[PDB]
């Protein structure tokens, strides 16, 4: 029995998020209203205090004389679907005849969008993201030529046997998905759900995954959360013998049904590595351009 008083008046057990703000609609920009001259004391919108860390609130009406303007300019193309749902390159897989990378007619690619910076710098504006996807595969020889060849793809989730060869038993794909496709056909294209254990893909993890005495030889696991490693993507030329033709495979990602959180700044230095925000130190270029004099253009 809760007979004391400090337990009755307690704030413990509050599953509610006190929100000061509340969203509003805005299918168009704001309509500028009319104003006239004012010569009063006290009222003074220009003088702000920015130490508080809030933005200004002065407007065209309260600083100068305006007219009425009925703005019909939409705000629909600044949304996230209309900003992210545009395909871009995320990977490349080579299957050459004789080389050093992948000569035996198979290749494994670790699913990771962070290898090309047009698409990485768009997502790295946000921290947590929750999105479906739509991959697309474009196969071609180095010359762009199109050849009559059969190909197999296989999504290898975590904990599953990675194939070690072209004639392996992991290619029966009884439970894993797969995509047979030819090059004479159009690009392959499939859809993807949100596959994480968590509730969002975080592009930035500040911590270590495991416990232990973190020595210097195990600092390569800084910034590694396994709730983003969504597995592996395998590919091979179907057959028992080697192929007559080299090949290259390009992978495009298109995001849809997006939700984002946590705005944060944007990269200004060139990328170097993956899963790693490192920058060159002796080559810190400014954020932008420069000139000769503050008093002159």
């Amino acid at each position: 029995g809760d007979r004391v008083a400090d337990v009755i008046e307690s704030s413990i057990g509050d599953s509610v998020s006190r929100a000061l703000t509340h969203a509003l609609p805005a299918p168009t920009g704001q309509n500028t209203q009319v104003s006239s001259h004012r010569l009063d004391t006290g009222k003074v919108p220009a003088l702000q205090a920015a130490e508080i860390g809030a933005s200004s609130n002065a407007s065209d009406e309260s600083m100068i004389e305006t007219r009425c303007v009925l703005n019909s300019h939409s705000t629909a193309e600044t949304t996230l679907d209309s900003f992210f749902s545009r395909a871009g390159l995320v990977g490349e897989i080579d299957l050459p005849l004789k080389g050093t990378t992948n000569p035996n007619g198979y290749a494994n690619w670790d699913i990771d969008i962070t290898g090309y910076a047009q698409m990485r710098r768009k997502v790295e504006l946000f921290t947590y993201m929750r999105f479906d996807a739509e991959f697309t595969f474009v196969a071609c020889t180095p010359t762009g030529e199109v050849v009559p060849q059969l190909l197999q793809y296989m999504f290898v989730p975590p904990g599953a046997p990675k194939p070690d060869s072209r004639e392996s038993l992991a290619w029966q794909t009884a439970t894993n998905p797969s995509v047979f496709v030819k090059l004479s056909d159009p690009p392959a294209q499939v859809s993807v759900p949100f596959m994480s254990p968590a509730s969002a893909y975080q592009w930035f993890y500040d911590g270590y995954p495991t416990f232990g005495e973190h020595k210097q030889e195990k600092d390569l696991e800084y910034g590694a959360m396994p709730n983003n490693m969504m597995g592996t993507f395998s590919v091979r030329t179907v057959g028992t013998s080697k192929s007559k033709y080299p090949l290259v495979v390009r992978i495009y990602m298109r995001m849809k049904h997006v939700r984002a959180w946590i705005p944060r700044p944007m990269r200004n230095q060139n990328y170097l590595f993956k899963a790693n925000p490192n920058y060159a130190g002796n080559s810190i270029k400014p954020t932008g351009a420069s000139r000769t004099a503050i008093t002159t253009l």
């Binding site: 508080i52 509730s199 993890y205 500040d206 060159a280």
Partner: protein, 245 residues
């Protein structure tokens, strides 16, 4: 009304005369977890006084050639009080924070700081300078403690991102003509309802002077900077033996 403020949580209390308004990070207050969002079945513990009070970390100095600092939360309190001695026992953790910063000066001094709160502030090394040499940051730069760690390249915040855009986060300034403190309140920012307190480090406080300190001789040169903070709505779960790290 907007200048004078007081902050009473726990046994402790803070006053201030030349302050500004209070900020709520990302527009909402802390909270305890819902029975829908949560996943673990064990009943937490919620002390409500012994942990939710103001702790004072360490007192820096602000010279003219200073560059900046950062602190990682909630790493700062893992060896301090009944808070820390719960966070070692348990495995799961949830909390908010109130954050108060001090720097006083007379009416002849001048300067400005920027007091920002950035979630998931990964640190990045310089790649040997040439760019090719892959490196990684050591343990004393990612969890430096309560004694803080000093920046080397503050224009990029040591992560390839400018400081010019750090105001989009919950920020405040300390312009010594106007104010002398900055109060910031923050909820629990993570994709998961509970998460560890020792491995993971949810956000980092930054303090970077933009306009440098300056004065004239005969005036007091020592201009400290003190950092005060309080947990709020703290929960714990997964009891077992104490783990330092």
């Amino acid at each position: 009304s907007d200048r004078v403020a007081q902050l009473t949580i726990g046994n402790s209390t803070i006053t201030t005369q030349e302050a500004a308004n209070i900020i709520v990070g990302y527009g909402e207050w802390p909270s305890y977890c819902s029975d829908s969002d949560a996943t673990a079945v064990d009943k937490p513990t919620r002390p409500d006084v012994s942990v939710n009070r103001f702790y004072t970390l360490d007192t820096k100095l602000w010279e003219k050639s200073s560059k900046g600092w950062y602190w990682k939360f909630p790493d700062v309190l893992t060896e301090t009080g009944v808070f820390g001695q719960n966070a070692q026992f348990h495995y799961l953790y949830r909390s908010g924070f109130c954050i108060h910063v001090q720097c006083n000066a007379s009416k002849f001094h001048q300067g400005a700081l920027l007091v920002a709160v950035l979630p998931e502030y990964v640190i990045g090394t310089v790649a040997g300078g040439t760019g090719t040499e892959d490196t990684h940051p050591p343990y004393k730069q990612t969890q430096p403690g309560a004694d803080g760690f000093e920046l080397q390249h503050p224009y990029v915040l040591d992560a390839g991102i400018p400081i010019s855009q750090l105001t989009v986060c919950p920020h405040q300034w300390i312009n010594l003509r106007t104010n002398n403190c900055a109060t910031i309140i923050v909820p629990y920012i993570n994709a998961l309802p509970f998460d560890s307190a020792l491995n993971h480090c949810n956000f980092g406080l930054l303090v970077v002077p933009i306009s440098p300190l300056d004065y004239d001789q005969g005036a007091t040169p020592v201009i400290p900077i003190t950092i005060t903070l309080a947990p709020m709505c703290s929960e714990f779960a997964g009891l077992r033996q104490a783990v330092t790290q």
